[PDB]
Design a protein around this ligand. Sequence first.
Ligand code: HEM
Ligand SMILES: N=NC(=O)c1ccncc1
Ligand SMILES: N=NC(=O)c1ccncc1
Ligand code: NA
Length: 250
Amino acid sequence: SGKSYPTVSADYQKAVEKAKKKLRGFIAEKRCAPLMLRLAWHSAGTFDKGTKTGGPFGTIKHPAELAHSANNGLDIAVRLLEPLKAEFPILSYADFYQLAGVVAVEVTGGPEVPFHPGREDKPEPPPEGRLPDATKGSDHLRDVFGKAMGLTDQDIVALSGGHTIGAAHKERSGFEGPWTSNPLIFDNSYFTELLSGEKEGLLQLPSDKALLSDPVFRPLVDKYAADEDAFFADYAEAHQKLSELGFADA
Ligand code: HEM
Ligand SMILES: N=NC(=O)c1ccncc1
Ligand SMILES: N=NC(=O)c1ccncc1
Ligand code: NA
């Protein structure tokens, strides 16, 4: 809604389709879907609606943005994708990284998030510090996702479900371990685990726990824990919106 997607050439479209297939095989084989989802999300999550700066515009590959503390370990993601990207010189890094994120969700069994090409690679990384802090709560989440990015409370909860794949690493954030028993499977288990309480071997961040106590977030957690179809629907909506922040006006 509110989007006017740019025209791209037939050759650009062909490259998107071929890159999508190549990314599926590569991501599946390398077992790096969670990292690629994090790479897409950190690329997009810096958008500030009031100034129209940051967002999914290829800047995460810049040494300067990779250096941001929130981006610990994402230099691995960038390196892993570089040989593949070089096979698709016509694609923007901006598009390529968002496409990797969409593919990461698909190959782990998640919803098919619609993808529209045309993001341009912008020269200037956003300032550091826009991404959310795992030790903070619901107010902070609204500041970051709502006031800056311009996403809804529904989007916040659905997107938090992205933690249904992958893990924290004590050498990256300092937190450690997977949120779920199946960290390469995209499903609603993140909310199931969040509701059941702490379990040995499984992670919950203070930012995850903040969803349980908020009057608006909690009914959504409950909905998603009960109804994976509803989760997949709202997830696909939120991921699309996230991937298109500042793109296509909008
Ligand atoms: C709600 C605010 C969020 C906070 C505070 C947060 C925080 C974190 C932290 C601390 C890690 C661990 C990094 C590491 O140590 O390796 C992590 C990993 C991850 N995040 Fe989030 N995150 C948030 C939202 C999101 C969103 C919106 C998505 C995507 C939709 C997402 C997807 C992921 C994935 C897939 C991983 C695992 C990466 C891997 O396995 O290497 N997160 N997040
Ligand atoms: N960050 N860990 C990974 O996902 C990974 C890193 C290097 N090669 C394959 C996978
Ligand atoms: N808020 N947590 C993060 O996103 C993060 C912080 C430090 N290193 C990696 C990830
Ligand atoms: Na899972």
